[PDB]
Amino acid sequence: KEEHQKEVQYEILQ
Amino acid sequence: KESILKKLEDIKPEQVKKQTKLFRIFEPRQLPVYRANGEKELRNRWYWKLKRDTLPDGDYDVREYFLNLYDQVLTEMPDYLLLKDMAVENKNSRDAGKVVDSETAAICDAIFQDEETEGVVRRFIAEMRQRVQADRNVVNYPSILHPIDHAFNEYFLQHQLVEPLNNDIIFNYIPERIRNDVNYILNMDRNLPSTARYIRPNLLQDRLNLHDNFESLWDTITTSNYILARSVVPDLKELVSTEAQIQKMSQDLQLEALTIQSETQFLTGINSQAANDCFKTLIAAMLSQRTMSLDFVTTNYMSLISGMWLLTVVPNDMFIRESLVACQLAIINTIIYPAFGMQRMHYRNGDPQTPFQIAEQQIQNFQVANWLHFVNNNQFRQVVIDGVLNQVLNDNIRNGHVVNQLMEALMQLSRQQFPTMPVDYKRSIQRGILLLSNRLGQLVDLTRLLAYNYETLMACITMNMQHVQTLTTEKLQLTSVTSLCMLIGNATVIPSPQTLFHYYNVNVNFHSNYNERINDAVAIITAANRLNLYQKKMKSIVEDFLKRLQIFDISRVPDDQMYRLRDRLRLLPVEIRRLDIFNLILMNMEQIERASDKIAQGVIIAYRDMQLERDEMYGYVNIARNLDGFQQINLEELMRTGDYAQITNMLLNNQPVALVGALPFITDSSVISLVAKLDATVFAQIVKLRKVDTLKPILYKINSDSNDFYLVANYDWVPTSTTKVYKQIPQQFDFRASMHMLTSNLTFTVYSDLLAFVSADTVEPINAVAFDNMRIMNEL
Amino acid sequence: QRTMSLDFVTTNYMSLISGMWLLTVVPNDMFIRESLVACQLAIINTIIYPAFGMQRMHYRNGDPQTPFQIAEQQIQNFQVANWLHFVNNNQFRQVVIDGVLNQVLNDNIRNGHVVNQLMEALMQLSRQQFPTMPVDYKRSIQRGILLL
């Protein structure tokens, strides 16, 4: 998948 | 057809490493201090001792110890670190500061609480805190360290791999061509700060040249990339229905039931799932540079016709020789020479010239000769672009104009009677090529689409795409080629940017891992050579290099390939991190071997009543620290080639000598053992039995704790001895001079994946345009 | 002053026809540069240049020059180039009132008057042939413009 792969990297910021 | 893709896709990125504990080899330790005359002080003193005195006997085993140490240090060597994490609080600081590590504060606390410490050191403990500067996002933390430890830690700090991150670097991380491709639009929803960081891969091309005489491994790699590439080529859309096309074909061919005809076989293999098979096979092969063969039959003349399109838009060098030789020969015999009354053909099997070559210079027709000229002289253009080699098409194929010369040729065949042969043969041929004439525009646009997706997927390649014929081939049915050429229309299909980013990340991860494992192997190899490790067989290391390249099976690889690969790896230089760590080990390994009070660096024998030294961590000792004068015999030389004649002659005749090599020893602490000359009773076993393993010199450490020291004060005799031991002493623990300030950044953040902030979408594919700003799949 | 982004499917030309209005009234600085460039580039490469017969673009997303700043010069028509001129210099205006700072608008936005320029440009796009475009698609776009 990619959406969780995006979510981790948005969450490192958030 | 699924294990390989799972092996590739499961190659994770290099897990970003970090440390929380400082690297340390030494630690302080209190010992007594015996004043000269040997007796004891009421005060003690700190000294540098080692953690983990796990040093073997023998010098070879020692060098293996330093090899395994080097591997441990490279494991512990991080990529980024923040010092605030490891920090702790000094319980005795004026300003209630912080120092960098737990053990640092333990040392500080132990020293402060002791009784025998000066006031300057306690002051210096009360004056040492943490300093910030949020302007630069920099912190300075205090630390206590041995100079070797400081060397390694400072190298970790200065030479850590992180780079500031921002959206410009998110773009520029994407290939040029895809940004420059107007059909793709890209946005995002974040603004990364200067605080951000990222680690960069190692996309350095193959140092090892697996495209030269490692053809089995290259076949493996090529297959892996081929069956990856199949996974990303789009599936066609809005194809023509099979019955809607078969009915046209059948009515064009006028298939009589009663009479036998060659024309029914043209309907063989007209389904879909072959069109996509060919479309996915050709491109995947040209990307992977995997050769492919041609299975077909000499009675389905439609296959031979569609082979023309094939051999135009796909280079002859892309196939294997015998297959296309057979194809060209069939074509020549059954479409071309009968269409000009030429002979059938007389083609020798291993003739150097392929049939289309000597056909180019027999017939008399400009169109067909020009077609043949293009075919015979079509080949990939090598060109290095954005670091990577690329096998590029003509740019007369990328636009569809070749197909127009092909049409010229087929029409100049349709206008030819076949004088040699009957009406029905001519009838068959001319029908068969009308079927492709009426598909001309579709073919033009198909060729454009293939070239487009080929370059577009090529943009997402990191490893140089060498062109060499492989051992193993891929089968290609010309029936599938017929199906593709016949069933296609009014439907452009473009790789989604997600497929592109996936095909890029996969190759990037594989490429970085290739380079990093190479660096690992070269490091250990160069280190074993420079450490003189001569019994070590460098085979397990290559297994560890191939198991980590997660596509090869080592259970069925030979054992000579490993050493050839080693012969290549020795030639490669080392990277900077590993080389510098190794060179820090080399200039300090001897000093580490001086410590570890379990082995000594040799034993002197000198049949003379020498003197004991006034060392103060010991008292009187039979210690030597220069090894000058008396000559020396190495022990590894003697344990390799047993020649005890020299040592035996020297011992029997009582000749002075030194023996050099890591040897154990016992600390004897009795003056009665000294007066009786017991340290010269250890060598008679060498002559009886000719082994040097039961060799444990005595270390006459004498002091006021030795049960018979009353003699020394009360007779005024300097302790004298024979057969001194070669060994240095500890280094005193200076607190102030062992202290350091450690610089680091403050509060950055690390991101592993990078194409997550992008959000991409294609324009509507019907208005999708190639390099020439002229639409693809527009014939309608 | 909460910067906001633009999320859109760049095949839905109605999204773009609706977003040019947004670019017109709402200042450009209020958007992250990347998504604003994306929206403008989709609008250009899917509506504008195909209407006037131009070839698409080869744009560097690392460029200080916004795509409408190029189109303002390349597009030879005052009905629409003037609109692009407005949009390229549609930023907030800083003014002090009662001590507090204020980000205010151009005063051709407060009254709705610049949309008349928008509609002249759009009706020009409606009166126009898309020289190479298919016609079943051309009619769809050229009618969807009329909807605004």
Side-chain angles (χ1 to χ4, degrees), chain B residues 93-328:
Chain B
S93 180
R94 181 182 296 284
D95 296 331
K98 293 187 187 294
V99 297
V100 76
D101 193 359
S102 297
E103 296 181 355
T104 301
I107 293 163
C108 296
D109 293 331
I111 288 168
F112 187 90
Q113 295 296 321
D114 292 334
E115 298 294 328
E116 296 291 328
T117 64
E118 293 290 330
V120 299
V121 302
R122 290 191 184 96
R123 288 180 183 270
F124 188 75
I125 294 161
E127 289 172 353
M128 54 187 282
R129 64 181 178 89
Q130 64 95 29
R131 290 192 297 272
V132 291
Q133 57 185 0
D135 296 334
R136 294 183 171 176
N137 296 320
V138 175
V139 180
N140 293 318
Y141 282 110
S143 70
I144 291 160
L145 292 173
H146 191 76
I148 288 96
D149 297 331
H150 186 202
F152 288 110
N153 295 119
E154 184 65 25
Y155 189 80
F156 295 169
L157 291 171
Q158 293 172 356
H159 298 86
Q160 61 185 354
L161 50 96
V162 294
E163 296 181 355
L165 186 63
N166 51 5
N167 293 323
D168 293 331
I169 293 166
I170 305 294
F171 286 160
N172 290 320
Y173 183 79
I174 299 167
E176 291 289 330
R177 294 175 177 176
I178 294 160
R179 290 179 282 167
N180 300 121
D181 193 359
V182 300
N183 296 320
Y184 294 96
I185 293 93
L186 307 175
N187 58 2
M188 61 179 71
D189 59 355
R190 296 289 180 264
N191 289 315
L192 274 66
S194 293
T195 302
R197 301 291 186 275
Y198 74 103
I199 293 164
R200 185 178 291 176
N202 188 357
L203 297 176
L204 185 61
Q205 293 294 325
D206 193 1
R207 275 82 61 77
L208 295 176
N209 304 116
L210 298 174
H211 63 92
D212 186 72
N213 202 355
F214 277 97
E215 297 184 356
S216 296
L217 302 175
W218 185 249
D219 190 70
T220 298
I221 296 164
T222 300
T223 301
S224 181
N225 284 323
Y226 174 73
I227 195 161
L228 180 62
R230 290 184 66 86
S231 66
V232 295
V233 173
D235 294 330
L236 296 168
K237 298 296 292 188
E238 292 288 330
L239 291 168
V240 174
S241 183
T242 62
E243 65 273 16
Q245 182 59 242
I246 288 164
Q247 68 188 0
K248 183 177 75 176
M249 292 168 73
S250 296
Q251 71 183 1
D252 290 331
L253 296 174
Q254 296 294 323
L255 295 176
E256 296 283 328
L258 296 172
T259 189
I260 303 294
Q261 294 179 357
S262 297
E263 292 289 315
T264 310
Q265 290 177 353
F266 298 179
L267 301 178
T268 300
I270 305 302
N271 61 353
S272 69
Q273 195 177 0
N276 292 314
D277 189 73
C278 179
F279 182 75
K280 188 179 269 81
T281 300
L282 298 175
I283 298 165
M286 292 193 285
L287 290 172
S288 65
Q289 290 291 321
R290 188 167 174 76
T291 59
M292 54 185 175
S293 67
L294 287 71
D295 58 350
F296 66 98
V297 180
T298 59
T299 58
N300 189 357
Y301 299 158
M302 178 55 66
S303 299
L304 300 169
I305 293 161
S306 65
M308 296 182 181
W309 180 80
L310 183 63
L311 296 173
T312 52
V313 303
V314 176
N316 301 121
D317 196 2
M318 196 68 207
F319 301 108
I320 197 164
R321 184 169 176 82
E322 66 274 16
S323 295
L324 82 160
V325 167
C327 184
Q328 290 178 358

Side-chain angles (χ1 to χ4, degrees), chain B residues 85 197 219 414 493:
Chain B
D85 188 1
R197 301 291 186 275
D219 190 70
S414 296
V493 301

Side-chain angles (χ1 to χ4, degrees), chain B residues 454-684:
Chain B
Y454 178 63
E455 63 182 0
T456 304
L457 296 170
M458 182 188 289
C460 300
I461 291 171
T462 62
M463 292 179 73
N464 57 0
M465 57 194 288
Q466 297 291 329
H467 174 69
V468 177
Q469 282 190 348
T470 66
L471 273 65
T472 308
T473 61
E474 297 297 330
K475 303 295 288 185
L476 188 71
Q477 288 185 353
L478 296 172
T479 65
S480 64
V481 181
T482 297
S483 297
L484 183 66
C485 294
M486 191 65 69
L487 303 176
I488 190 67
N490 73 357
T492 302
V493 301
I494 303 304
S496 178
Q498 291 80 23
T499 54
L500 294 175
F501 296 173
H502 187 260
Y503 181 64
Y504 185 69
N505 284 320
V506 171
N507 288 319
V508 169
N509 291 318
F510 180 78
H511 194 193
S512 178
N513 195 358
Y514 184 69
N515 296 114
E516 187 67 30
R517 300 287 79 75
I518 290 164
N519 291 320
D520 283 323
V522 176
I524 286 88
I525 292 162
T526 296
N529 290 326
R530 294 182 68 188
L531 295 172
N532 196 1
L533 295 170
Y534 57 86
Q535 298 184 355
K536 183 168 170 65
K537 293 177 73 169
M538 303 297 288
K539 184 175 174 183
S540 66
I541 293 158
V542 178
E543 296 178 354
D544 189 74
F545 173 70
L546 271 71
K547 290 175 187 177
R548 295 291 299 151
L549 301 177
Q550 299 175 0
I551 57 169
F552 299 100
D553 192 359
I554 299 92
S555 65
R556 64 180 179 76
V557 72
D559 302 335
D560 62 355
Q561 283 181 349
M562 295 182 184
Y563 289 141
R564 291 179 62 237
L565 198 58
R566 189 273 305 276
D567 297 336
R568 289 189 179 185
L569 290 164
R570 293 184 303 187
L571 302 171
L572 274 64
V574 186
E575 68 180 1
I576 303 304
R577 306 294 304 286
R578 301 170 191 263
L579 184 66
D580 292 335
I581 295 293
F582 186 67
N583 291 316
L584 291 174
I585 290 171
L586 290 176
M587 67 179 291
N588 291 318
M589 61 186 288
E590 69 280 13
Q591 180 176 359
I592 296 163
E593 196 270 329
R594 301 305 195 183
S596 183
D597 295 334
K598 289 183 184 295
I599 56 89
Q601 294 81 24
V603 65
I604 293 164
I605 299 163
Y607 296 94
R608 185 178 297 103
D609 194 359
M610 294 184 287
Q611 178 180 357
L612 271 71
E613 188 175 4
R614 289 182 177 94
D615 284 331
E616 63 93 20
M617 77 299 287
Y618 300 97
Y620 291 102
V621 287
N622 61 0
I623 195 166
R625 60 180 74 179
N626 59 359
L627 182 62
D628 291 332
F630 300 118
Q631 66 188 354
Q632 63 184 358
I633 296 167
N634 190 357
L635 274 74
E636 63 87 20
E637 185 270 333
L638 184 64
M639 294 175 74
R640 283 189 288 110
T641 304
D643 291 331
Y644 293 86
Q646 189 183 1
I647 190 66
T648 299
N649 189 5
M650 293 177 80
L651 290 173
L652 294 173
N653 293 119
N654 292 316
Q655 292 185 358
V657 70
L659 300 173
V660 177
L663 290 169
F665 60 96
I666 65 163
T667 64
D668 193 355
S669 297
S670 182
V671 179
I672 301 302
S673 301
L674 183 68
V675 300
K677 299 183 285 295
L678 274 70
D679 191 66
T681 67
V682 179
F683 299 99

Side-chain angles (χ1 to χ4, degrees), chain B residues 438-450:
Chain B
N438 289 321
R439 300 291 296 169
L440 163 55
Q442 293 82 2
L443 296 172
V444 170
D445 294 332
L446 174 60
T447 299
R448 295 180 74 192
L449 187 150
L450 268 69

